[model samples]
Target chain A: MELCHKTVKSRTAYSKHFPHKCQLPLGHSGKCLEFPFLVSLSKTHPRIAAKIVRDATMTMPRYVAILDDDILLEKFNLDMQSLPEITRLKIREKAADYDSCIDVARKLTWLAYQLHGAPIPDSFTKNYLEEFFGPMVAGSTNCEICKLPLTIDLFSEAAVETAHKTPRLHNAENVGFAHRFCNVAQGNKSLDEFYLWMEEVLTRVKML
Target chain B: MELCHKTVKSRTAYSKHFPHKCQLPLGHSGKCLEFPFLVSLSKTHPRIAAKIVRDATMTRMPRYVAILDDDILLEKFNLSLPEITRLKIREKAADYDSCIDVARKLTWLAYQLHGAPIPDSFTKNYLEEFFGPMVAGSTNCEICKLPLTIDLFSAVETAHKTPRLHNAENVGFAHRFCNVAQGNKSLDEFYLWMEEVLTRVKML
Candidate 1:
């Protein structure tokens, strides 16, 4: 085992090699522990799972093992959903495997740009965005809110902004590029309220 | 399909048959259908089944319904409905008209635990359509069909006509001996058993 500083393969092998040597009886026999076995033990025998996880010395395995529980995973998911994109990117980048990817509930949150493998909501980095939708050059993409061509001046009212169709639903379908003014005006009003507001606005404009 | 009164078997069959037939598919079925394809469609699809009951209907003034809805009964009992019965009702879906009382009991319990009101969605008319046509009074024990003594010394107690349904609709005053004898058997079984014994006795 890595912590024991000995070459081991299975539970039997670990016991044989490190008899009276293993202070902690964790099931990490190989350089990497058996993940499925650990997951099953977590469901079936939670005390043993916690004890084994408690014994793990490394940060990545310990974090992954602890967060594998349903409560913890949901907490992580909800937290990840609301936080600012930069903070999310920073957290995920640190949590990723060698700054490339992190496994959360069997799915990878890829920090490094890949055509696939990352969850769409969490994959908001420039590399992934540019890779997925091409450069933000004018006439390249339509603003999701106004259905007009997106502009390059990102700080301007007419500039591009990423807007979510439904708040709290941080998924591929909900999140898209839009003009800054259109997105801001749309705000959190559901399409019905926004449409009603638009109707009133158009009526007032007609009178003017 | 029992509702649209078609000869279809399962939900899929009903869906295929009534491609444009349903006005109010109370459950997922396209018609007034008892689905689940299982003996316990209630257990498998509690939500759909519960909704079916929702469209159907209640009672009690039964201890099961009232104790749950009113706050006074909570601490007074210092107890709860047995998990066995709770889970069984969850698993044991039936025609809502037949077991609307049980459905009400389940809903009342849900409301009790949640501190919410049991939505009296179904009216007296809907209940009557299934549960009524109340005949003139008869003093016969509902479970045993034996004479029940109403006097202080009478051996009568509350009983569920169908076992495990602790609701007013299923429950009525029956002889203590009859209710205990019913045991885990359904009301139908007890009736058949009594009929079989009567036949044997008549032959003898």
Candidate 2:
């Protein structure tokens, strides 16, 4: 189902199409505060699991999958085959999370390089992932948990070239000492942004 | 490691404290646009395994475990642990789908009851969790993947509640129908607000 809410009062990018509720004074733009905690929740998605556990003895679903109203459900087959017939079938529409690393890698390549600056040593990309990949990959073995975009091809090309050209690329992977450099020249990005930056370095180096 | 890129810009609630990177221009908030394809890759988390093939792809870790920058260096945890030793850690950050829900649910709630003036069905005085117990409990499940909020709660309650009381709630979880209601109401907020509503019901 698709609907539109007023812009400012709504919590989503598409709220402009909705109508008003409760005769309550709609805020700026004649749009009432759509979902008061909606944006709060989405912005807090990264911390939802922790926040839920922080307050209650029992925990709730850690992650909340946000989808768009325009989503085409009929286009694909959504059959529940593996689970038991006794298992409850629960499906929900998802909202969008603009914050993720692999997402950054694919979409935010240019922005990433601008933040970290062009790689000094290109080969460093491969080395860094080789060193950091295991943990990054293992911790993020599944896309749902770690959420880090892992592209071996991207990682290999970016760092390997820089490592060959600028030794700093290799040094950046040092983990311990590399952090000192990060402190001095850290790229300020949300976790997602950092992932985006890494992506740019890897992708750009690959193409070069 | 702590690093600052005063140039990158964002208007996120968390960004109130820190400056953005240098490249970000004035009034430049962060965007998912620049990273479209990457967003697809980043959306997956550990819990998604329930839907996907669960391979010994990586050793599984305890649920609810998270690491911080301090933890990385304090015990040399990142280095000490072998590459294969650590497990994938899912994050709870909001992605596109979640962001859309907040916006929709908020709009739906405010509009649906514009004049009816339904009294706050349950009192807000019970145990802290009483205001929304079920919603509060939703956290035990996957953070971003699950629908654990009050608005969703009320909607679900409406579905379950008899017509006598369901005037203020939904009677079915039908996507097309509920979304139709969401259209006239604060549709964007379906997940978050509804989750809160369920907890409120539990509290009652």
Candidate 3:
């Protein structure tokens, strides 16, 4: 809370000198107003939210909040219009405490970049995002590519690492969480091509 | 008008006897309410409308209204009401076999409405096809022996001699103009005229 307060204060002071520019660290070129709770979310959960922003693939902050509050898992039950506003605000508050101020500022910069355009087509709306996050706690959800369980370490370390490196292409089928290595292996290839390539690789391995 | 009234009265009486089925002259099986104006339209234009009913391809009355009012033609072919089924027109109005009667009615009405010439299918096809293909260019007009275009008047429509059971020999394509002009006459009478005229004109 103290760190979040200090960061906002410094941002305000810096804005006095360059009012038109984004005062957040790095060169993210928009105001915090454009992404209201993004800075706070990254501040609180650097491992989860900061990496998403740093990779420039920030989805709604409510999506990032899934890591801290499993109650958000209930997002699946409610329709889009009925998603409780208070829950989102609570998650934003928690995200600020988990990481440092500079980490928060840099993420805010990247998040502004991610949100500069209209929302991506069918990009992880709450319904499907809940589906992606749901089975993580429900029992097990297998990675679509490698047929391995997406463990918490695999998600935070490997998934984030893979996303940072290869940058998954946005498509109808590619949005699900997967083994980071598998996602990287399937980079930019269509889902069909990726599967066919996987089959050929297995056949070659069997021959060897 | 009197003929239309009498036809409706007869249809209503027949409908009472077969309340559960279509009283339309042949083996058709829908309510008279399903096509209220079909009986009247057939009475006034028996040669054309009656065959459509006999073929069991009787369309709703609004399709006939399209021929009477060109403004309705611009509406394409869609009308929706709670009681009426919605229609989608995936093809030109002329393409629907059901719309052929409406096309023929429009061909005749155009002559009276716009003082449009009695479109000689032979001349229309010869001139129009020379420039580009017509919409109904799938077959030759029966009376004119010229390629049919998709134009409303040049609409390639089926001609059934008996209007009974459709068959390979009995069913054929003809222009809307030729079909309307031929009226209730047998194809034999039209062919006899064709032969007499062809012999005289002899390219010599």
Candidate 4:
């Protein structure tokens, strides 16, 4: 709420007209169009959500206005809580999918900031990533190829290398993880050639 | 012991010449010099222990025989269990860190043995690194697989996948909830149960 007030006041003249809004904030109008939060589009168009969130927080007063005591805003905050035990269980069960979505969000967040000519706050990015996606399958966060989990240093060079090497699976229906070895295992061959190479390797291993 | 007999007989003619030695072996001659398990030297020469352990097990018949049945040979040839443990820790630790781990254990043991003062080298520069977040991540309970809070106040914590009963096999990680669920169960049992439950949930 404080964040919304600061952003609204800094971005708009509304604060001048209603100087006491910060103390006794005006209730959100019933007709206020709830910000979608881009949850539905996050998996598909992560960069769009990233850009919108950046805008909503940094500038764009009208967009920020909807944040004033909004039920949707409350629910967004609620998403961070422990509730609906089944839902939490589901999150753990499909932890890789959870990881995939967050990884996409992070990449998009970085890229969106670059495109907007905005300086990305390292602390904010790290905090946001942790707050949003920190508690997945605890030990399973790792390269899809090697399955070696990330170390404590989020910005480790190994992380950078993994990010650079692994192409994001961008399909709306199929966003997930993959790593270098499996990608490279297909070799520098045609798709069919790669399949044949895979079969040969499988056969050799089975025989051994 | 079975492996020792098979190895001793097939590799060396000791079994054919003296069958009773397999069951009741004699002590090593007093002239024998013990092979250091290479704990003190692994950082400078990592392969030294590997080669020695391999030689002790595979090709060196007399050394292999000494490693077998005789109580005197056992005492003379092998490190004490605690020393063996420290050696194992040293092998797993990074070079300087490995030295510190060994030195730390040795210092504590020395103090226990002869009232020696704890060394500063062992006390200073001990580093610990955990793989997960210090704060809550909005995920789920690792044990029950239930959703969790992103709040720092959330009860969830990191767990070691490999229990710390033996430091040599305790490098991996997991969640606190899951660790609790696995309490006192062998990995084989815990993993097998996990596979079944997770598979039923289509999470395998």
| Best of the two (2, 4) by lDDT | 4
Reference contacts reproduced by model 1: 0.00
Q: For model 2 chain B, where is the 10-residue window of minimal lDDT?
A: B50-59
Off by over 4 Å in 1: A1-140, A153-159, A204-208, B1-204
The C-alpha RMSD of each candidate to the native structure, in angstroms, is 27.6, 31.1, 25.2, 23.1
Ranking by TM-score: 3, 1, 4, 2
Task: Locate the minimum summed-lDDT window of 10 residues in model 2 chain A.
Answer: A157-166
Candidate 1 residue A106 C-alpha distance from true site, Å: 18
B73: Cα error in model 3, Å: 94
Q: Is the docking of candidate 4 incorrect, acceptable, medium or high quality?
A: incorrect
lDDT of 1 by residue, B127-191 (tens): 23434432223334555454443241215444566754554366555555555655556767755
DockQ each candidate and list the results.
0.01, 0.01, 0.01, 0.01
- Interface RMSDs of all predictions? 38.2, 21.6, 36.3, 16.4
Which of candidates 1 and 3 is the stronger one according to lDDT?
1
Top candidate (lDDT): 1
lDDT for each residue of candidate 2 in A1-208, tens digit (9 for 90 to 100): 1112333343532233332222112333334442222223334332332222221111111012223223323222223344354432232311123222112221122112212222321332322333323322222221111222223222221221111011112112211111111222222333334334334433433452
Kindly report which residue pairs in candidate 4 clash with one another.
Answer: A88-B147, A89-B145, A134-B137, A135-B137, A135-B139
**lDDT by residue for model 3 over A1-208, one digit each (tens)?**
1111222323432233322222232433443332233444445445655554443322333224434344434433333335587755654533321232323333323322222231221222222233322211232334454444444344344542322112333322224444444455445555556444434433433453
Task: Tell me the tens digit of each residue's lDDT in model 4 across B1-204.
Answer: 111112123333434433312211124223221222233334443443343233222322332243244464345444244766444343332222222223323222222222222223212212111122222222333233344432322233433344433222232222343445456555555445434433333332
The residue pairs in collision within model 1 are B42-B93, B43-B91
Query: How many pairs of residues collide in model 1?
Result: 2
